[PDB]
Amino acid sequence: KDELLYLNKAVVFGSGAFGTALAMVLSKKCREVCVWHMNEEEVRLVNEKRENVLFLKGVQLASNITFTSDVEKAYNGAEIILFVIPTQFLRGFFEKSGGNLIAYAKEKQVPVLVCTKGIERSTLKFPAEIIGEFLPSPLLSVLAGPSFAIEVATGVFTCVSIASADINVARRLQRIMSTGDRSFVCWATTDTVGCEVASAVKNVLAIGSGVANGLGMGLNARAALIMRGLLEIRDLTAALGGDGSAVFGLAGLGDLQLTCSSELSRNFTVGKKLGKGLPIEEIQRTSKAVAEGVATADPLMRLAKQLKVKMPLCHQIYEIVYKKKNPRDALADLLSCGLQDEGLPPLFK
């Protein structure tokens, strides 16, 4: 079935750049799209201006997108639910505001699409695992790929993966999310673990790429970091029981290479500033958008230690981000290994 599905209503819990961008996609597919934001005064401003002046400036909202601070008005009648709340705020949302949403989603068996990327600080859980404490796992699918919000929001060609345990669920969602003007194209997979691992780790690597840039290194170095970094995604995926199909697909390779290669990435930008010598405390004090890699770096290290997975690049980035290791010392220690084989396994016999 290559034919598109359309809905009466979608709800997006996530008022940031990406939640808004995905609301813009859904506006083409749904009669009505509701976006939930926590602050009522800010909601009124966004609705009045027909522009998310908080988190996606310069993009006029479609008329069929409405912001609200009322969780129940947001989800009522929704036929798909998207979560795009940043990782470290997801749990709080369900604890504070999620009770009746949970009962609704369960009652009406509403598909949930997790678009958040990262690892939660103390629990070491991926976003879908956080959500899985509150909602049944069969309702949960994962969206992941190279999808900068500004390009997605304005309908510039974008490919993403949708992962679900059951491939027929992924294929249905692919028909809901994909657009007939071919601006947003989804590809189905079952590798939910590979998708979420790649998504979380790629943000940490992107800080590394930004550090390289800030230190005055070039495009050759960036390419080397992407290539060696993907190995870390691959090894963690294997240790966590993922089948690894996502690693060299849109969620892994595609998103990793995208995020490591542009200042549009908030994580890249954090890296650049660290490489130029700013402390993380000042970066984060003056930042108006979430850089998930910052909070992910520590729980990623703890998870990898637990599973005995060596992640040399992510380890040094963690040292820079959380232990104030001078980026030049981190670089030196990274390259202290001496000469080696590329060391990749054959794909073929």
Add this chain to the structure above:
Amino acid sequence: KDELLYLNKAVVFGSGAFGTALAMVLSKKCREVCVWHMNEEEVRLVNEKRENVLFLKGVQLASNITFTSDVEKAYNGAEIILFVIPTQFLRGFFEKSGGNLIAYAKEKQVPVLVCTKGIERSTLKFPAEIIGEFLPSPLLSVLAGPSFAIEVATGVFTCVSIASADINVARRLQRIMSTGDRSFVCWATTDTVGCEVASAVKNVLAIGSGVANGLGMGLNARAALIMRGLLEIRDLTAALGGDGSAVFGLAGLGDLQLTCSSELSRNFTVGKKLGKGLPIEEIQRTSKAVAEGVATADPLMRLAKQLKVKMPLCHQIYEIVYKKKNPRDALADLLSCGLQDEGLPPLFK
């Protein structure tokens, strides 16, 4: 052993941007480096200016680099030979000027490092196979990775792969080419087929990335092209009997992602101009540097046909370059497939 090796002399056959860049690397490892160039008047100019004003403007040559037009003086006493002559000119060099060089390399068993990328028009041969008509296989190794000439020549951090059938040869060359200031770092491998396929095909794909950019597409689109394109490298590598370890290594993923992402790529730049509406004939007449993808695209299609390997992106790129196909029509034909699975095989159970 990971201690560096130093030579008395190296010779580089290839006076272009990359040959000159690699001579700059070798000037750190060798007492003397000779670069062969076909034209004596231009040789005198380069030597006088202490700058390759023909093909690498703005970079001052090390004092221990000398250009020459005399083949026999170039290789005399050299303990490594690099070939960096563009693919379509390699054969002519051996037929017209290579007789004594060939005897020297054989008699003294001098390691030869092939740095040229592409596929030769009539024969469908990779650069090491062309050279392999004249020099025996145990002397041939291949250099491949994300290594833009300007960054290499000026000592900005670069990683490359060196492939040889015997891993011990590759590891020896790695010790000769890698620098102690850690500016140029080599990784050993045996996947010579994978390296050379990736090197040839990535140039064609880079034209495609350029076309996307010239058509006004964004970074999300670029990431998708890189991800899908690598599958074509992978499939062709399998058909040609490579073990595929290089596909997601520096030669494949690394070099592809680099070349598809920067106007420093000659092939990207050709693509961009094609995407903007310029005919290939105008591009080629105002071109001051080789775009290997242009000439490669034809034999690449013939080889893929011969092997029954589908290469959907490379096919459309070939149509744009050789058959006057409107880039917008090529894009439409690419995007007419309907919704699919990502369809990558698992790496693990």
